[PDB]
Amino acid sequence: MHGRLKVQAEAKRLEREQKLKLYQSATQAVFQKRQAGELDESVLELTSQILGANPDFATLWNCRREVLQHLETEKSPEESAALVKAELGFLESCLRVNPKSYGTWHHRCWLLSRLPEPNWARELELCARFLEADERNFHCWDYRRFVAAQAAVAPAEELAFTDSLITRNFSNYSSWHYRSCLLPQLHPQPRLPENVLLKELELVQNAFFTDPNDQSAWFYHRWLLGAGSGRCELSVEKSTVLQSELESCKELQELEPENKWCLLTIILLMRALDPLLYEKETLQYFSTLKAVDPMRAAYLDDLRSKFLLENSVLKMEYA
């Protein structure tokens, strides 16, 4: 939840005492009302104050839902639609203030899920707005997938939204992640098709040459490297692309010699091409990588040992 602030200081300590009493009396009353079975708009009022400042007070979200449910039975569909539209406005004012609260996002999904005519395009537009403010807001990305499902939005449309998100700025981990789940849906086998993979390789390689410090594209690139054929199954095209990637990373390594991502990728590319043929260079690359990225020396030694082992198995396989 909240964490944290840095460590006239009486008018700050005064106002805190003042807000507590309003919070305290309001909370008191909502509970009194609730125990009294008073499921009315006074509870919606009382809770709107508290939830705006504490959207993690889950029991109050629950109270709202009880009020809303009860009222829906005893109100015309015109009075019910009005209470609903007020609730959408309330939710949005809450999210503008704290866009990372489980409670508020869940209440919105609960709300939208039970509406007779939900306006999903409007909800997707809400997501677009929140994702411009914070393109790593996983609550919002999750709400966006929920909406997309509800509106039976096609993976290709979400794939286009991810492309527009990637070229236009950094903070792309969330967007690459979404692509990793979208692409397999477009090509749905019980390991992406080569043509698609090769295209994704092109797109990710652009990203990490555009910004070599963008870790998200390097992490996605490593998945792409595994998500394919095999080294004695390399097409001339894949072989050529991966070779071209290797030289391009070495070019990068010339420019950014402290860039650990490009070094690790060179090793993984060589593995992907020919473990034994590239054995000496791989070992050379480990020593360099470990000097560049010492916090990871333990990881890197374990990876190298895994690879040395695989190389022993490949040499034994010799006819």
Partner 1 sequence: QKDVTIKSDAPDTLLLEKHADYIASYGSDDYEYCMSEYLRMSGVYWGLTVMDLMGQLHRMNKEEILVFIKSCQHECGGVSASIGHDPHLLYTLSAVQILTLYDSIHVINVDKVVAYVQSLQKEDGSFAGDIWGEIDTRFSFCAVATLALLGKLDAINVEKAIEFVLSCMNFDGGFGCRPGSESHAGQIYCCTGFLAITSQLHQVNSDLLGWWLCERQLPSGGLNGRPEKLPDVCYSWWVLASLKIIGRLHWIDREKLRSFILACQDEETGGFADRPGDMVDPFHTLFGIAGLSLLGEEQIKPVSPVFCMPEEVLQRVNVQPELVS
Binding site for partner 1 (CB under 8 A): 1, 3-7, 16-17, 20, 23-24, 27, 31, 54, 56-59, 61-62, 65, 102, 106, 110, 136, 138, 141-142, 145, 171, 173-174, 177-178, 180-181, 213, 215-216, 219-220, 223, 294-296, 298-299, 302-303, 306
Candidates 94, 104, 35, 98; CA nearest to 65 is: 104
Lookup: tokens for 15:
């106002």
Integer Cα distance of 25 and 284 in angstroms: 69
Question: Which of the choices Zn ion, partner 1, none does residue 173 contact, using the CB cut-off of 5 to 8 A by kind?
Answer: partner 1
CB nearer partner 1, residue 56 or residue 194: 56
CB nearer partner 1, residue 151 or residue 239: 151
Kindly report the backbone phi and psi dihedral angles of residue 6, in degrees, each rounded to the nearest multiple of 5, phi listed first.
-65, 150
CB nearer Zn ion, residue 4 or residue 280: 4
Q: Given the rule CB under 5 A, which residues bind Zn ion?
A: 3
Integer Cα distance of 55 and 19 in angstroms: 16
CB nearer partner 1, residue 10 or residue 17: 17
Question: Which of the choices Zn ion, partner 1, none does residue 141 contact, using the CB cut-off of 5 to 8 A by kind?
Answer: partner 1
Question: Which of the choices Zn ion, partner 1, none does residue 31 contact, using the CB cut-off of 5 to 8 A by kind?
Answer: partner 1
Q: Which residue is nearest to Zn ion (CB)?
A: 3
Which DSSP category does 296 fall into?
A: G
Shortest distance (Å) from residue 215 CB to partner 1: 5
Question: Which of the choices partner 1, Zn ion, none does residue 208 contact, using the CB cut-off of 5 to 8 A by kind?
Answer: none
Residues 263, 253: contact at Cβ < 8 Å?
yes
Shortest distance (Å) from residue 253 CB to partner 1: 19
Integer Cα distance of 91 and 102 in angstroms: 12
Residues 183, 200: contact at Cβ < 8 Å?
yes
Q: Is 90 helix (H, G, I), strand (E, B) or coil?
A: helix
Please name the residue ranges forming H helices in 98-133. 102-114, 120-133
CB nearer partner 1, residue 57 or residue 90: 57
Question: Which of the choices Zn ion, partner 1, none does residue 171 contact, using the CB cut-off of 5 to 8 A by kind?
Answer: partner 1
CB nearer partner 1, residue 210 or residue 240: 210
Taking the chain, what is the end-to-end CA distance rounded to the nearest angstrom? 61
Residues 285, 307: contact at Cβ < 8 Å?
no
Question: Which of the choices partner 1, Zn ion, none does residue 193 contact, using the CB cut-off of 5 to 8 A by kind?
Answer: none
Residues 204, 224: contact at Cβ < 8 Å?
yes
